[PDB]
Write a protein that binds this ligand. Structure first.
Ligand SMILES: Cc1cc2nc3c(=O)[nH]c(=O)nc-3n(C[C@H](O)[C@H](O)[C@H](O)COP(=O)(O)OP(=O)(O)OC[C@H]3O[C@@H](n4cnc5c(N)ncnc54)[C@H](O)[C@@H]3O)c2cc1C
Ligand SMILES: Cc1cc2nc3c(=O)[nH]c(=O)nc-3n(C[C@H](O)[C@H](O)[C@H](O)COP(=O)(O)OP(=O)(O)OC[C@H]3O[C@@H](n4cnc5c(N)ncnc54)[C@H](O)[C@@H]3O)c2cc1C
Ligand SMILES: O=c1cc(CCc2ccccc2)[nH]nc1O
Ligand SMILES: O=c1cc(CCc2ccccc2)[nH]nc1O
Lengths: 340, 340
């Protein structure tokens, strides 16, 4: 039973591990391999702040609600031990800024201490008329990626730097199953005009004094496009830039400028931070995550493909859910192959 | 009108300044001079984390209450100028924890958004069964100290490094009001037996992931005498050591071990912290603070003396209200002296 997982990103690695942890007992020669064009120092996943927080109303696909949920419980049930900071996982409270009023978020009750910004609080914010306050999780992109990797590697799972041209180049080369974890780049193996990139740019700056994330919103510019401050482990991230169809993986002046103005306006102590650096990446956007099976009809018999992409700008808030899902689906492939 | 401030910790410096800003437009020769034996790194002030938060229950003297409020009110009022970082003044949220339930603290309304621990929050704490959570401020002693200094100096209050032997050395050598800010050490210049060492000791450590203070409380072991963990700007303050009468300004191997255990039991991820260093100081303990006048019946006239010391484990928490009050006394002098 040989398995190729494409994408060394959060999804790929989470689903890799999640399938392996689940099925090495109940399956003789489980071979797993990740094939990836870009590896952990250089993926989109590597760019995310890594705070957990689903959009503010509820999904096209009300199950995501459940996937985010459990991502949450899982991380939190791991929040004290020697592992936590390896992983780069730790707890963090902070703010949600809105002009007008707005209904509670579905999720309200997964997080701890969710509540509404009382008025002493909102004075602090002259540009804003309302918010929430709550304690959430960061799972920092880089670390999660580096640990997952050392767990996969202790599990005998084998990495390979490549471009996969198409499912069948890989069926062809030998594989009962293809877990498709390929992100914004999904479409280039099997067209899907539903997927598009949410371009983003953030600044990592020096501000250790920052102890709260602060998230503004402004539907006049939409989601993921109003300035945010996510204190990280080592450094604080500064963004607010979302833009459909932008395929420029390259830092932009105008964006910088927008990031830094809004962020300084939001918290002026930042005017003294030292910029460490800056980065772009591509949210894989889509009305809903794609995660289903597809028997790829292909020579003497059909290979099996699990699709697990389109997580957009909430990839880490969810990944674990997803991964436990593509694992279930995976099991099924098994019972059918009369192997379960 | 020449004025001597003894002591250069937080009490002195704030009182010095507060007095300068209040009264230098209304005294022509108003000469200010600060006398002190230990200065800016070498004082009890430097050793405090700088967390704002008054004892659980309400004070032997219920103005101390207002002077926390005031102090707090103000600092918070400056939260966000583009100094606060210089100040080392910044917001922090965090946990209070207790084995039993407890009446709300008196100040709950001063702190940002205080609220009791929920069951979920709670489970990160086997060994504690009840508690609070609220957002507050830290005023990091080392910085606030450096700051008041650079303020004081432009204002050209002058500083000399020197152990004063008695009030009258100073009155003698020509001064007019004397403001006594001398900390735990007030005894060497006027017997006062209500005042004694809260010798505390702390560890400063590299845990850049912690974004919350956590304070462990217990009647059994008594105030500041339990595990607490306070994110500072560069570093994390690690302590829960209080001991009456101990006069040893030297770091203690048991205490060393006591801090590290209490903190690790509480936040096992702290196993990775790098110890960076460690330190001891003397809480100026006393039933109530001495902020009052006295006419020292020196030589020909009297010289007046403001007493401002014995502030406990909570100087930073209160120092401002104290300084105002201390200047309101200063100003009560001038009129009865007919210089207003
Ligand atoms: C600025 C910004 C901030 C964000 N902040 C957050 C946040 O706080 N929280 C949160 O939950 N999410 C956040 N996100 C969202 C999150 O980053 C994405 O959901 C997530 O990282 C995507 O996971 P992935 O594995 O799907 O994609 P990626 O991380 O890009 O995985 C893609 C992999 O696909 C490989 N690949 C593609 N095609 C092929 C091929 N044919 N052959 C081989 N390899 C291939 C690439 O080389 C790479 O290995 C943010 C996104 C951005 C842009
Ligand atoms: C471990 C620890 C943690 C703490 N954490 C906090 C906290 O989180 N928050 C909070 O609000 N408080 C905290 N405190 C309380 C705070 O530390 C003190 O109350 C404060 O430093 C006392 O003010 P002070 O200037 O009187 O003391 P000091 O700063 O020691 O004032 C003493 C000054 O007077 C001088 N002096 C004394 N006698 C003479 C003399 N004859 N001649 C010349 N100079 C003299 C010394 O050189 C020094 O300048 C903490 C204390 C400790 C020990
Ligand atoms: O830029 C991003 C920032 C984040 C986390 C913070 C956030 C969460 C909800 C709404 C707005 C911002 N997630 N995904 C992204 O793309
Ligand atoms: O050691 C100390 C620590 C602090 C601040 C944090 C704190 C506040 C309330 C209860 C326990 C700790 N203040 N004063 C001290 O002496």
């Amino acid at each position: 039973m040989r398995v190729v997982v494409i994408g060394a990103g959060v999804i790929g690695l989470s689903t890799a591990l999640c399938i392996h942890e689940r099925y090495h007992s109940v399956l003789q020669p489980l071979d797993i391999k990740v094939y990836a064009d870009r590896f952990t120092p250089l993926t989109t996943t590597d760019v995310a702040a890594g705070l957990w927080q689903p959009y503010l109303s509820d999904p096209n696909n009300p199950q995501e609600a459940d996937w985010s949920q459990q991502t949450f419980d899982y991380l939190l049930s791991h929040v004290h031990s020697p592992n936590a900071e390896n992983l780069g996982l730790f707890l963090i409270s902070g703010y949600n800024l809105f002009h007008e009023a707005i209904p509670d978020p579905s999720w309200k009750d997964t997080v701890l201490g969710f509540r509404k910004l009382t008025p002493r609080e909102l004075d602090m914010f002259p540009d804003y008329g309302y918010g929430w306050f709550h304690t959430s999780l960061i799972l920092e992109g880089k670390n999660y990626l580096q640990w997952l990797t050392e767990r996969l590697t202790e599990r005998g799972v084998k990495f390979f730097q490549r471009k996969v041209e198409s499912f069948e180049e890989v069926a062809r080369e030998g594989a009962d199953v293809i877990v498709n974890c390929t992100g914004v780049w999904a479409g280039a193996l099997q067209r899907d005009p539903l997927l598009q990139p949410g371009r983003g740019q953030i600044m990592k700056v020096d501000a250790p004094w920052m102890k709260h994330f602060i998230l503004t919103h402004d539907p006049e510019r939409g989601i993921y496009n109003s300035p945010y401050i996510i204190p990280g482990t080592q450094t604080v991230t500064l963004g607010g830039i979302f833009q459909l169809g932008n395929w420029s993986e390259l830092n932009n002046i105008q964006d910088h400028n927008t990031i830094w103005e809004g962020c300084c306006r939001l918290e002026p102590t930042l005017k003294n931070a030292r910029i460490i650096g800056e980065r772009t990446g591509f949210r894989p956007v889509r009305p809903q995550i794609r995660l289903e099976r597809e028997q790829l009809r292909t020579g003497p018999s059909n290979t099996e493909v699990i699709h697990n992409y389109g997580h957009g700008g909430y990839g880490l808030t969810i990944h674990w859910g997803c991964a436990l899902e593509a694992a279930k689906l995976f099991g099924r492939i098994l019972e059918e192959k009369k192997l379960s």
